[PDB]
Amino acid sequence: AAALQYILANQEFLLQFTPTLPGIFDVFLTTLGQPPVPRGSFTITPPPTTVALNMPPPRQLDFTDVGNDARITCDPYYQLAVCIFKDGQYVRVNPEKASVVTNAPNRDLHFVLDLADNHVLLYLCDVTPSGLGDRIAFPIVDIYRIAFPRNTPVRASLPYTGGGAHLTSGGNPFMSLTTPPAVLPAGVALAALSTSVATQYPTYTLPAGVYEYVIE
Numbered sequence: 023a024a025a026l027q028y029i030l031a032n033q034e035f036l037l038q039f040t041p042t043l044p045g046i047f048d049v050f051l052t053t054l055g056q057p058p059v060p061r062g063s064f065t066i067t068p069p070p071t072t073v074a075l076n077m078p079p080p081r082q083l084d085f086t087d088v089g090n091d092a093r094i095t096c097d098p099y100y101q102l103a104v105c106i107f108k109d110g111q112y113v114r115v116n117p118e119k120a121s122v123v124t125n126a127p128n129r130d131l132h133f134v135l136d137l138a139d140n141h142v143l144l145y146l147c148d149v150t151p152s153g154l155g156d157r158i159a160f161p162i163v164d165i166y167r168i169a170f171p172r173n174t175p176v177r178a179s180l181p182y183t184g185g186g187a188h189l190t191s192g193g194n195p196f197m198s199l200t201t202p203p204a205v206l207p208a209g210v211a212l213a214a215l216s217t218s219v220a221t222q223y224p225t226y227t228l229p230a231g232v233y234e235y236v237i238e
Contacts, residue, residue: 041067071097073146073160075131083169085135085177087215089119092164094129094146099157101129105147106219112147112154119217120144134217136225137178139168140235141186170232175209178233179218179225188236196233197226 025038047064051057076093084090094103102122104115119134146160170176178189178199186199197204200223209229216224 039064039066041069044068069097071099071157073097073100073103073158075146075160075162075164077164083135083171083174085174087134089121089132089134092131092133092162093127094122094131096129100147100149103129103146103149104131104133104162105145105154105159106142115144116217116219118215133165134215135168135177136217137168137176137228137233137235138181138219139166141181141237142166142219171230172232173230175230176228176233177213177217177225178228178235179213179216180220180223181235183220183222185238186236188234188238190234190236191228191231193234196228199223199237 023038023040025036027036029035043066045066047066049061049064051059051061072095074095076095078084078090078092080090082090096103102120104120104122105112106115107113119136121132122129123132124130143166144162145155146162148155148157148159150157178197180186180199183200185201187195187201189196189198195205197206197210207229209231211227213225213227218224
């Protein structure tokens, strides 16, 4: 926005300008006959854009399809804003699990928990440009801190395309991360909701159980 109000008595023009784009604007003299002479330079200014993740409000771990509300405090620039990296650029999040949704307080993230997150960190990331992370990315430490209770099941999905056979309940191997037939016990079953960073193998449910999230 630019606003221009003519004030006779005062010989002044009110200038309301938006701090947007870096730019240093050159102004020239107006009075009648319009003589060749400049006055100087006016500077337009880049915006404060901060994006901050806020805690899931209940102390409760929604390891289901509903997941949980990890709110965002953002200056209104970008929606559906979770990312990681792809050979040289950045690779966009699974669309099921990373639902930044609704005309709630600010930006509301309803994120489906997954053990994947033991061998992987995501960033809350600038969407709007044809390039990711210009108006920053928020390293989402908050989500990585996944807990393993022995009363609500734990869902695990292919954390990346490498060999995670070492998925273990006190040592014993289970539904290993990428292997020709995994050891599916009587408390495990595969999660139709393909909440996996990768295509090859989708999410499964491990039971009420503590599992060592390890690679080879």
